[PDB]
Amino acid sequence: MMLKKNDIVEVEIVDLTHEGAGVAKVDGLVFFVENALPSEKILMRVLKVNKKIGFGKVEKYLVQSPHRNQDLDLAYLRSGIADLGHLSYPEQLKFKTKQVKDSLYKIAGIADVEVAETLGMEHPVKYRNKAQVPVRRVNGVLETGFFRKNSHNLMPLEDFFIQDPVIDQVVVALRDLLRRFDLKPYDEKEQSGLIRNLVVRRGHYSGQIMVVLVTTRPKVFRVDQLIEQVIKQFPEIVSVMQNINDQNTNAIFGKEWRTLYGQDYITDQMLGNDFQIAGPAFYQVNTEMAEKLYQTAIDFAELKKDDVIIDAYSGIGTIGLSVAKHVKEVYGVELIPEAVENSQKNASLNKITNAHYVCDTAENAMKKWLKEGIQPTVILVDPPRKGLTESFIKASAQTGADRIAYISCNVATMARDIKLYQELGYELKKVQPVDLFPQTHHVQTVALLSKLD
RNA sequence: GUGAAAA
Ligand SMILES: Nc1ncnc2c1ncn2[C@@H]1O[C@H](CSCC[C@H](N)C(=O)O)[C@@H](O)[C@H]1O
């Protein structure tokens, strides 16, 4: 055949990638096609031909999937806000379950462990308690929005679909204030301007709002007036922070934080307890579903009064502090000073005195605790996407903890890590996926591993 | 390197 860019070829979509792209096979090439679902027949325009793969685009739909959601605004697909939004919600859940099974088999060689059907959200919309929104000049106008996938091209948006609608309103109000005061958006190309991002977090139960102005420099022209106006429109704002990021980095936050108004934290609830939450601290973005995730992990772990728990990657302390009053001891490790400081305070708020935190990397803390002779019976881990280090895994396995509950937002690194745990005497017992990120391709899981002897 | 998150 010898396909080239611009050729039009008729293909059937036969699979979805982990990121939600349609898969077609033509002349020994695997083609990836945006906005194309399994069983769809399309005319595909060839965009790019590599050696073993190609990239295509839908030129014309000949037959569409019975599971296609016709109502999705394509802006949400292209901006990567809802990159599975073109699929019906029940089939999103089935896709996520399949991804977990496929990953455990392909990466860990596990085919015989029960993976429960992904726990779905009843109304899987408007759920995020945080927005991290770039501010850029687009056609001469200051705009808030989101990047087109695989780019830094800002697509202006006001309705973000999957955010707390109050957050959407706050972001728009802030955008309009930035225009009114003629504050200059960040320009990555020219390394100029002031306003890089607006971050807004709103407590899922409490409704308390933190605004963060992420800027290139300390001085913001008439920020006091800006703050005055925004708190008038939104009296639930308890905190306006500034974060100063003077580097050319894709990391949203730089090192320097300043309180411009009110508190340096919001308070919200999880599993009936109160948690203070700093701007730079992590907080699960779908509180409703994160509670169910935590409860699954707790249920899996079969906690007893004599248990000694490690809460690794503990953040503001939500997981360990949810169980502290039912176990003997909780030991937590968290890298970010502001977050571990939240956890310390949070223990005190909830009258917990058997929770002990260290500010360190998880692997360092694990080695130190192993040296001190801490005797954990249960290790709970909740790492970022990159997963655990081999040194942490090996160290954790030397404790002889009989139960490990791995909470993961990236099944590829979880499966890799599970494969190492299985080499060190742990057996994967069960896996429960939970839909923390509806409308997106992202899968959250909890896995229970238990020590063979 | 954090729903998107280029070089
Ligand atoms: N190498 C490392 N060691 C310890 N903590 C780390 C780390 N890398 C990232 N972190 C922290 O790991 C956390 C992952 S988010 C999970 C936090 C918490 N368990 C919760 O459910 O809310 C973040 O707080 C992040 O700052």
Residue numbers in the entry: 0 to 452
What sentences appear in the manuscript?
In this research, using protein-RNA crystal structures, we demonstrate that multiple structural determinants collaborate to establish the dual enzymatic activities of RlmCD, which has been previously shown to catalyze C5 methylation at both U747 and U1939 of 23S rRNA in some gram-positive bacteria. However, in S. pneumoniae and Bacillus subtilis, which both belong to gram-positive bacteria, RlmCD and its homologue YefA have been proven to be dual-functional methyltransferases to catalyze both m5U747 and m5U1939 in 23S rRNA. We previously determined the crystal structure of apo-form RlmCD, which highly resembles that of RumA and contains three individual domains, including the N-terminal TRAM domain, central domain, and C-terminal catalytic domain. In all structures, the cofactors were modeled as SAH, due to the missing electron density of the methyl group, while its density was clearly observed attaching to the base C5 atom of U747 or U1939, indicating that the complexes gained in the crystal structures all exist as the trapped enolate intermediate 3, given that E443Q eliminates the final step of proton abstraction from C5.
An 8-nt (5′-745GUUGAAAA752-3′, hereafter termed as U747L) or 12-nt (5′-743CCGUUGAAAAGG754-3′, U747SL) U747-containing RNA analogue representing the loop region of hairpin 35 alone or with two additional adjacent base pairs (743C-G754 and 744C-G753) was therefore crystalized with the construct of 1–454 of RlmCD containing a E443Q mutation, using S-adenosyl methionine (SAM) as the cofactor. Given the higher resolution of RlmCD-SAH-U747L complex structure, further analysis of protein-RNA interactions for U747-containing RNA substrates was mainly based on the RlmCD-SAH-U747L ternary complex. In the structure of RlmCD-SAH-U747L, the RNA substrate interacts with RlmCD significantly using a combination of hydrogen-bonding interactions and aromatic stacking. As the methylated target, the U747 base flips out of the RNA loop and interacts with residues within the active site of RlmCD. In detail, the U747 base forms multiple hydrogen bonds with the side-chain groups of D381, Q283, and Q443, while the O2′ and O3′ of U747 ribose contribute two hydrogen bonds with the side-chain of R384. In addition, an edge-to-face aromatic interaction is formed between the U747 base and F281 side-chain. As the immediately adjacent nucleotide to U747, G748 also participates in the formation of two hydrogen bonds with the main chain of Q131 and the side-chain of Q162 using its base. The aromatic ring of F145 inserts into the space between the bases of G748 and A749, pushing these two bases further away from each other and forming aromatic stacking with both. Consequently, two partially joined stacking networks (Arg127-G748-Phe145-A749-A750-U746-G745 and Arg127-G748-Phe145-A749-Phe146-His151-A751-A752) were formed as a “λ”-shape geometry in the complex structure of RlmCD-SAH-U747L.
